[PDB]
Amino acid sequence: EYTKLLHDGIQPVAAIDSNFASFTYTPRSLPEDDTSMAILSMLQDMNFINNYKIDCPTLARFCLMVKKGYRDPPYHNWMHAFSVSHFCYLLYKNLELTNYLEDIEIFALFISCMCHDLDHRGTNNSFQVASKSVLAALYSSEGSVMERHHFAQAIAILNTHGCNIFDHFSRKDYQRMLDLMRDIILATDLAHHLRIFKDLQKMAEVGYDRNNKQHHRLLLCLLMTSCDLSDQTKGWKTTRKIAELIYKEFFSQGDLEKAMGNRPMEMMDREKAYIPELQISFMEHIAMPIYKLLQDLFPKAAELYERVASNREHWTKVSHKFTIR
Ligand SMILES: CCCCCC[C@H]([C@@H](C)O)n1cnc2c(N)ncnc21
Ligand SMILES: [Mg+2]
Ligand SMILES: [Zn+2]
């Protein structure tokens, strides 16, 4: 399994695809069998293997473990985690995060991306609370139920024998790695994003400051959120396709909420849901602000905001006679 992975060395990024390091590249085009390899390539391209002296066999096992630690709902599967991770790599390469963040922080972000939805069951935090799941029992009172479970699953993978990519770290770094991984994964929750939004705008107002450690915090949260939503930054074929997976998942939960006598949200109810207006609402309230904050901090992230705005134009366009339900 893992010996087969490292039986030919770490492939360079250009050999996977020539446009691999570009924003136009859709990582979902890469076959699922070649994705663990692609992770190793990105980690070596960012020079994280040398920097933190990550043992390669251990990194390979960790990667394969993170992979099988996802289930197979329509959207929250390994391929989502992979595409979010690829996008984090695109941010490194194109927005040059090395000028803004510490190396250990960009490393944490990438690792977080791989783990950020570990063991997702195709349902959200409200459903866990509502169905009295053990996850809700463990985490509901602190908030962000699934997010704490994801981090917890990351930890259980990192402490599996032969997967501890941090085992040799200094005490100070091992700890910062743990704090950042938790904070970055928690940041993926809409509720969290809704809190720090005021502080994100103020950061974008005054200008980014490498000496301000709160700006690092907040920048990491914004970056994570923008990797998580990166399906909205590709072409219409990708974005239109991914909407089908998202609602496929949402509609399953909606059915399960009905079977326990709960009234699902409109977006979860296929009898109520008109996808165009829902995505338009998602695009303007959540997605476009996120990428407009990313543009304000990185002028080079202008082409991402436009493609999200474009995709929101495409929803209005195709609304003319789109499937009514
Ligand atoms: C700032 C954090 C936003 C979190 C929302 C995540 C959410 C589901 C799929 O988890 N999601 C992700 N893409 C979505 C989309 N195109 N339409 C509706 N919901 C979406
Ligand atoms: Mg999540
Ligand atoms: Zn996600």
Report the phi/psi class of residue 242: left, alpha or beta, with left for phi > 0 and alpha for psi in -120 to 50.
alpha
In angstroms, the CA 84 to CA 77 distance is: 11
CA distance 38 to 12: 9
Residue corresponding to tokens 């980014």: 208
Q: How far is CA 278 from CA 114, 199, 272, in A?
A: 28, 27, 11
Which ligand does the CA of 144 lie closest to? 2
Asked whether residue 117 is marked as a ligand-binding residue, the answer is yes
Chain breaks after residues in the chain, where C lies over 2.5 Å from next N: none
Resolution value, angstrom units = 2.4
Q: How many domains does the chain have?
A: 1
What CATH number is associated with residue 42? 1.10.1300.10
Range of the domain at 120: 1-325
Q: Is the CB of 282 under 6 A from ligand 1?
A: yes
Solving technique: X-ray
Distance in angstroms (rounded) separating the CA atoms of residues 241 and 244 = 5
In order of 22, 196, 301, the CA distances from 86 in angstroms are: 10, 25, 16
215 in catalytic set: no
Q: For residue 233, what is the DSSP state?
A: G
Measured CA to CA, the distance from residue 203 to residue 146 in angstroms comes to 28
Rounded CA-CA distance 305/291 in Å is 5
Q: Is the CB of 206 under 6 A from ligand 1?
A: no
